[PDB]
Design an enzyme around this catalytic site. Sequence first.
Site, PDB file in Angstrom:
ATOM      1  N   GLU B  66       0.755  -1.230   0.000  1.00  0.00           N
ATOM      2  CA  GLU B  66       0.000   0.000   0.000  1.00  0.00           C
ATOM      3  C   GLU B  66       0.803   1.309   0.000  1.00  0.00           C
ATOM      4  O   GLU B  66       0.629   2.225  -0.811  1.00  0.00           O
ATOM      5  CB  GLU B  66      -0.958   0.040   1.190  1.00  0.00           C
ATOM      6  N   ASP B  86      -0.861  -5.080   3.145  1.00  0.00           N
ATOM      7  CA  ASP B  86      -1.393  -3.879   3.786  1.00  0.00           C
ATOM      8  C   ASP B  86      -0.669  -3.987   5.172  1.00  0.00           C
ATOM      9  O   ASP B  86      -1.079  -4.887   5.886  1.00  0.00           O
ATOM     10  CB  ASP B  86      -2.893  -3.833   3.921  1.00  0.00           C
ATOM     11  N   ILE B  88      -0.932  -2.221   7.715  1.00  0.00           N
ATOM     12  CA  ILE B  88      -1.959  -2.020   8.699  1.00  0.00           C
ATOM     13  C   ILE B  88      -3.301  -1.961   7.951  1.00  0.00           C
ATOM     14  O   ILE B  88      -3.558  -0.853   7.405  1.00  0.00           O
ATOM     15  CB  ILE B  88      -1.745  -0.820   9.656  1.00  0.00           C
ATOM     16  N   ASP B  89      -4.040  -3.060   7.952  1.00  0.00           N
ATOM     17  CA  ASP B  89      -5.394  -3.026   7.306  1.00  0.00           C
ATOM     18  C   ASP B  89      -6.280  -2.514   8.426  1.00  0.00           C
ATOM     19  O   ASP B  89      -6.373  -3.145   9.503  1.00  0.00           O
ATOM     20  CB  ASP B  89      -5.791  -4.427   6.789  1.00  0.00           C
ATOM     21  N   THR B  91      -6.190   1.169   8.838  1.00  0.00           N
ATOM     22  CA  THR B  91      -5.389   2.343   9.346  1.00  0.00           C
ATOM     23  C   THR B  91      -6.179   3.345  10.161  1.00  0.00           C
ATOM     24  O   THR B  91      -5.678   3.872  11.194  1.00  0.00           O
ATOM     25  CB  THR B  91      -4.677   3.080   8.125  1.00  0.00           C
ATOM     26  N   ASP B 216      -5.895  -4.982   0.481  1.00  0.00           N
ATOM     27  CA  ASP B 216      -6.892  -5.118   1.514  1.00  0.00           C
ATOM     28  C   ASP B 216      -7.519  -6.519   1.548  1.00  0.00           C
ATOM     29  O   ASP B 216      -7.959  -6.957   2.649  1.00  0.00           O
ATOM     30  CB  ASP B 216      -8.050  -4.105   1.419  1.00  0.00           C
TER      31      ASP B 216
HETATM   32 GD   LIG Z   1      -3.678   0.377   5.436  1.00  0.00          GD
END
Ligand SMILES: [Gd]
Lengths: 272, 272
Positions: B66, B86, B88-89, B91, B216
Amino acid sequence: WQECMDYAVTLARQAGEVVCEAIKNEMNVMLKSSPVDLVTATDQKVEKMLISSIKEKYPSHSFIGEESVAAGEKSILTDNPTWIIDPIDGTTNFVHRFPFVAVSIGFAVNKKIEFGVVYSCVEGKMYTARKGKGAFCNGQKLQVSQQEDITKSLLVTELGSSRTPETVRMVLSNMEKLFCIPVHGIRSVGTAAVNMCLVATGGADAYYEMGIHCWDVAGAGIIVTEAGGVLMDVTGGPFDLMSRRVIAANNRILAERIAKEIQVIPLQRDDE
Amino acid sequence: WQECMDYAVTLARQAGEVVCEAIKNEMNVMLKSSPVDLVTATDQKVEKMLISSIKEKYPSHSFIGEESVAAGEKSILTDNPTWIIDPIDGTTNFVHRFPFVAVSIGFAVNKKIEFGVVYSCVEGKMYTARKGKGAFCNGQKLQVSQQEDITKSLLVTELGSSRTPETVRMVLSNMEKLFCIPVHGIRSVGTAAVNMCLVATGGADAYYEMGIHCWDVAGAGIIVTEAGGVLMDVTGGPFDLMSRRVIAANNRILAERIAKEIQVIPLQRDDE
Ligand SMILES: [Gd]
Ligand SMILES: [Gd]
């Protein structure tokens, strides 16, 4: 009231293990007033369990329970010590095994909530609060977030139990307005009590909903306030436990802003 | 690939630890393409760590991350073994301390997902799947729900990152249409990867969204399918990873009903 409270925690933890073992098994799902208005034997069992145990210890106390109201009982709140309960807040979630289900207990005297206990069973998270004494989660002290700018906020709400086109349209239109301010986002866990606990932890900045009942909010209300939050009616007036409407926010700036953006839906009071 | 997989699991736990420490600290919140398109320094360092750790063991593999794409790296999917991440899916959840945040790693060979790892760090749940081997959560095998009646289903979705009124209006009308069938409910935890793992556990019956990215859903896609569910395009057609659209359901019956009810939202592909 400490004794009552101490007792309430033990009861909720115990009811929580019944819910918890139940969620893994098959359920006989029944309908109440609509095809989306569910109940299981577990909601009924749990409520019966809670009510006999409390009356056995506090015979003079009154009760307002979701399923007993459904069975005939009347949801009128007097000055008398009253136990306000939703045996399973997140009944739909329970049916589906969606892991957000709580035992919610609010204790009211002189028509004002004194303590609240909210047990999110699947996570094993015990949320409690006593007026003037703090909000805790598994012994950790809670504090709402500091956010005063709505444009940087994260909101929680639910779609509701009504499937009437006019009402749904109003609910979505309210969503739309908030969304478009814009706000950072909107989340929905499927339980008012859990939603309100997320506000008490600082995880969400505010929760609002129209169409709830006193049993859905009695336990969690005091947790938000003892964590430093505010309860208000969607009309912008004072929170009213029997009104079917709530704004639970970190602060009054955010709460009045939300009140401002949304339109109220006509609802039948719990005491009518 | 097992080897690759074994190594992905380790990396996920490690990155998971960085996220979890960071979530309780003060953060540097930055903007990407808009005021609601957020990034933190944690998003960036976790992604950097992940890629630099991977490149080292597997110098010839490709990456779609990402924050890297954000930095100029394109999102073209080739047959080469590619890691789709990702860091951090969820965020936005992360910025607010909303407790649903995941590290998502998908690994594709010949443009097909071979394995996926989703670590919901806050809850401490490690979700993994390998094509033909099954889907697990902390060592317990997963299976989707058996619900074939849309009228008795629980759906998960997200409102999206667009605040364009036309678009917002399309997302909500799509919601309205499903809501009113009716379905039992709609939930949103704030992350495609977690929403999809809830389908794989049988907690939700289906997930749909227009506007996600390949990073994602790459990790969680294979979790749902190895759990016995299905991935489909919103047209009812075959799932297309770079299309920004997905239906992830317990089965083809619910998948197709949703596809039949919703209207497509025009979006730029990940490969455009
Ligand atoms: Gd993210
Ligand atoms: Gd309930």
